[PDB]
Amino acid sequence: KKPFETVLIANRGEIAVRIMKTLKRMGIKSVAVYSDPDKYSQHVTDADFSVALHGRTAAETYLDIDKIINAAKKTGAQAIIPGYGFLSENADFSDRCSQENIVFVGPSGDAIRKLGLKHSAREIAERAKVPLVPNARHVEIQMMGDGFGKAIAIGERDCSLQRRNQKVIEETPAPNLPEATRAKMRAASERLGSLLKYKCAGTVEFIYDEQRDEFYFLEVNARLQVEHPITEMVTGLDLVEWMLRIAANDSPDFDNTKIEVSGASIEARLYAENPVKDFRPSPGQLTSVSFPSWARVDTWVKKGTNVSAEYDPTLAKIIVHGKDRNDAIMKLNQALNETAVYGCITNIDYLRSIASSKMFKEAKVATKVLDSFDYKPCAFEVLAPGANTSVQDYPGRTGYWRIGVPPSGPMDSYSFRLANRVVGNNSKSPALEITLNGPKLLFHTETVIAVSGGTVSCTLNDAQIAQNEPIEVKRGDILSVGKVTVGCRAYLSIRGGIDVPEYLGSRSTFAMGNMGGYNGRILKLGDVLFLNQPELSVSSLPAPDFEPQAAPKSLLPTLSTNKDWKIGVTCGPHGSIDLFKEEYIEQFFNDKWKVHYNSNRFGVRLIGPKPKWARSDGGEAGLHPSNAHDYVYSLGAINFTGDEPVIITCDGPSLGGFVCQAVVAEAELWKVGQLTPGDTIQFVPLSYGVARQLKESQDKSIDNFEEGSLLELSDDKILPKYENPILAVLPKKSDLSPKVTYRQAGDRYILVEYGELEFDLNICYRINRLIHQVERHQTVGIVEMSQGVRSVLIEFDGSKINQKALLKCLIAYESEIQFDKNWNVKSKIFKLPMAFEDSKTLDCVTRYRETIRSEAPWLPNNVDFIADVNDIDRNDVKNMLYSAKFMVLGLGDVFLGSPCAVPLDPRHRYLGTKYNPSRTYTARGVVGIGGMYMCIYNAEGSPGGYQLVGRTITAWDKLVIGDHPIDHPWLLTPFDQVEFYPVTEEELEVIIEDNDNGKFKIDVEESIFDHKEYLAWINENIDSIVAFQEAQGGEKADEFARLIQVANAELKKSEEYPDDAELLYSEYTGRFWKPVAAVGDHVEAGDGVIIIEAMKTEMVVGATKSGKVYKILHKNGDMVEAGDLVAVIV
């Protein structure tokens, strides 16, 4: 009673997965076959064995009989089961199996030929006494044949709900069909099947006139069918099992088989398609996949799956079994409601609407219905995207700064919340942030809208519309928001908010990390965003709280009028003379700063006076005197990346390697969200208390929404002079209890710094113990404590505990920390593949040479700099990377759990420096060395300042699908160990793809780091260690420190042409990178002409219409103002 020992599936997707469940249950070994895009699919995983066919297309792989038959040969499969599609109804193939001693689980090549031609099929039907055609339904009969003249009708299905002939919903039993006519569909089907000596499963389709009560032969499908599961629900038969048993001549005894149909059952087909744009296939990575577990769902997808446009966009078949038609229709609606699939556009909403219709319920179904079905998405549609339009929410992705997950959310949080409030949204509603110029949107449903923020002209069906007022939108309406004239950004709110899944607590988009928002990115031409109409929705979005209302005008923020701004900050952490000269601190607050073309949500870069440093270098943390033992920064901090500063904003870095001078006050950050290149700013010192006042005034303004409650910067709010950021110093007491320095670090945090400016492993354990002391006292008011190398940043809620109070608890819990030199900690050991100096790492330096700084003591090659400043061979550097034991000291250096690690061997600690200024771009998985520290850049496209050395795999698993035992996206924890092992660039790209699909087995072992054992290891090597240390710096390192400190050059300061040229202008201000085309090249419409760097992005300015490149205006290094002429095409 085992038909076959091993069976191959000549198929992919959902049918392959379903055939395999049966095979498994039957104890039959299964064999997968896959194309190249399918190498990661469920059916390949589920099988006992598998054979790569090589190639991409249907024809190259699944359809190539030769390959298939070789595949079954190679694995010793006694049988091939084909599914449907592909070689399923291909008779040469059925015949090849036969002529090869492989049993084709299907009918004979002859029967397939006899049924393939529209007219041979008609004769058989006639001879079989099947009524033929001498508002149409589609009723089909599922039949089984034993290949020896016996045939049995298993039931009928209605498949009327078809769109341009493609089935979407099927059901059984057929509704509104009398027994007289069902029993005679059955018997006709059995005659047809008998006459053929039909073998295995086939379907006889009929046309049915419901009114006339008549049916007519349409065709036989000589195979199993996609909708077969509804039949299985009502009979309890496993049709694949039957096929297998029949195909091996161990058929069920047909004359004695009693089939009972029990209840009613319905199936909906979930496709990766867009119903709003013509059912156009929608490829991409599924980001979250949830199905009702109580329905039967035949699928091949889960969180993680990459859905391609190649084969057929089926995702899942959702199958429900009810007591009767009405029970099943309700079940199906619940199932559809409970189906959450995100990452691709689906037809779920289209399905929901159909499953829900009065039509479907009254059973007024016909092969024609779906072709004139009124489908309206409760949603908008992007007719044009705008330069950078993102779904955001507020406060954003909070909870995870210690990991280096930024909050994201709106860059100007005040306007954002006004916009929300104006429409009466709960404050958690998501909205769109428009940057520089907005989208044009088509609304498919009705709602209220508002726009707030910068000055932008806004259109509804072409009539100007007011900002800060609730505008009523109709359906067919086109809202359009143009260029931002004053400020950078505006906010478009929609009553009820926008419907997008949360990631890590928030619907905010973090584009760098492909996280959150509308599928991890800015909006695109063609996107379709869903709203939350309470009557037409099943949504978890928070319902509005308030009736809409124009914002009182006294509550509007005062944007600058003339590209010039005063911006309030709290002094600290590092605006003190241990780091900067006195006069430089004065100049910092006295002079104006100009906003630099490289500014974006990661941070806003500034041009102004160059620093005078109090130290000659930064020692072990890097030579440049701004370099600091990596510590966690504050939102709003003004970070000195070498000799130039940048304001850390809501998509910004967290654990970082440079000093911060001051921090924009929480409530002042909105200003920074409205800066545009060329703006001037001046930082204005502000006391902790004043900073709280502004903030609280914004909350009251938003909460009550009442004239006069907004406070803003004014002279009597401003400190006379910058103050000292050092809040208190505890003196050093003993070896394990170092000095403690408490620095004010923003409106929201106190930075605690241990020791002298120096690394010491004990201090890392100590930070762990401080954190533990706060948990033990369960202190009220503390928001998040973030570990750095020798510091921890403590975020508080000023409405729960004030600055002074938190300082004193901290000073006090500090004396409660007790531990000895012999401590231990759980430590995970990661062994990670790394390519030395591969192409993507080197190209990162190249881009830095050609876009920012082309000469520097650490250029042209970073490894050579490490080698040279340390007096070793480059291969000595390579050797240490592959023998060092890197202990993670903190996360988010920089972004998504990017580690800051330090070799456990002191002889592995090399002098170095961090870039001056930092890069704007780094490749995912790049490994860096910053002074003596090591990092892995977990995110693609991140600013970075470490010396680049090679590349591993990201230690951030966004969807937690990797093959490892870690339960969240950040794979590392402080005190873990990373070791590198050598692979080739190409071997690394294999691993990278494999790991992105969860098919790479990360080498991780749980263990324990023991400081007692470690201190003993230092002893048996103390000699070598000391020799190494005494001989490290010198005059050579000092010349380097001198050279490293030279500020980069100031950017550059910024005739007749043929009569009907295309003149080409850059939209943005940026520095000219490189040309794309050569003068005299032919270009098409769209083709690139030149490249700019603007806003940390590689900006292609391209040809409008086709032509020849007549002139290209700039060379590498030129500044280009927005609206400047950049090329001419003739």
Ligand SMILES: *C(=O)CCCC[C@@H]1SC[C@@H]2NC(=O)N[C@@H]21
């Ligand atoms: C735009 O370039 C914003 C950059 C913010 C500062 C960058 S992030 C990585 C470097 N490390 C660091 O501590 N600051 C630099």
Ligand code: NA
């Ligand atoms: Na605050």
